Design a protein around this ligand. Structure first.
Ligand SMILES: Nc1ncnc2c1ncn2[C@@H]1O[C@H](CO)[C@@H](O)[C@H]1O
Ligand SMILES: [Zn+2]
Length: 262
């Protein structure tokens, strides 16, 4: 339930890969004035939840140029991760694009991308590796109380749980290997091999195998946001990848093998 305390309203979107649908909710939140960190394109803000509710007050309207399209939206939203993970009082992180080559579609793609990587994390863990991994939930929020931009586009953001500890990036989306840890690189290799080269998960970053904001490359280069560099991204990973003990333990081929022709 949404608290009566002072904060701003949002439409909250959760993607559920197993039913292949978005779940639409509302929430109230209070976000700090200044960001605590920044990346290339976005800034991160500390936020507290003032509760999660239904989307009943905020009708979608007609389905012509609705994103996501109505057929991708669950009619029912009684069950979801948000109602426990974003319950009243929860401290979490909000990310906003600075200064904006970001369509509406991009916010949803990026969050769906994180949910897909979250599935890959569970698949990896089922092999009983020495260190289990996990990707945080992420959500799209339409900050509906904020006045639209120069164009009548609502203000959009993504939100995710707060990581406590030293945040480290382990690889980039274009071949950088940034720490000496084995598990992040083995996981990237695992995703390439076990997907039959349909995709790779890189930008493996977070605190101690609790990861967030990954990026996927696919051979055809379609979908998965603007950070999908296609075969180029896959090949760049291969040039710098050196199999380690976790790769061996997972019985991964030391020969990675070529990209798919489109
Ligand atoms: N979920 C999160 N929890 C805490 N810090 C984060 C989170 N996501 C991103 N960051 C911070 O923002 C930076 C990204 O530029 C990271 O280096 C990290 O310091
Ligand atoms: Zn390897």
């Amino acid at each position: 339930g949404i608290s009566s305390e002072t904060g701003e309203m949002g439409i909250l979107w959760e993607f559920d890969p197993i039913i292949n649908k978005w779940i639409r909710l509302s929430m109230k939140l209070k976000v700090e004035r200044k960001p605590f960190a920044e990346g290339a394109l976005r800034e991160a803000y500390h936020t507290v939840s003032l509760g999660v509710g239904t989307d009943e007050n905020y009708p979608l309207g007609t389905t012509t140029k609705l994103f996501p399209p109505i057929e991708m939206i669950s009619p029912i939203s009684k069950n979801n991760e948000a109602m426990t993970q974003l319950k009243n009082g929860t401290k979490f992180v909000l990310k906003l694009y600075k200064k904006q080559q970001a369509s509406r579609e991009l916010y949803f793609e990026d969050v769906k991308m994180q949910m897909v990587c979250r599935d890959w994390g569970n698949k990896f863990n089922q092999k009983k590796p020495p260190k289990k991994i996990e990707f945080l939930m992420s959500w799209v929020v339409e900050l509906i109380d904020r006045s639209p931009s120069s164009n009548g586009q609502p203000i959009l953001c993504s939100i995710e749980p707060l990581l406590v500890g030293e945040f480290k990036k382990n690889n980039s989306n274009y071949g950088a290997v940034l720490t000496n840890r084995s598990t992040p690189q083995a996981f990237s290799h695992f995703t390439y091999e076990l997907s039959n080269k349909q995709m790779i998960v890189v930008d493996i970053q977070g605190v101690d195998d609790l990861y967030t904001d990954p990026q996927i490359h696919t051979p055809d280069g379609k979908g998965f946001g603007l950070g999908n560099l296609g075969k180029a991204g896959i090949n760049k990973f291969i040039t710098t990848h050196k199999c380690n003990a976790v790769c061996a333990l997972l019985d991964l081929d030391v020969k990675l093998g070529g990209v798919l022709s489109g």
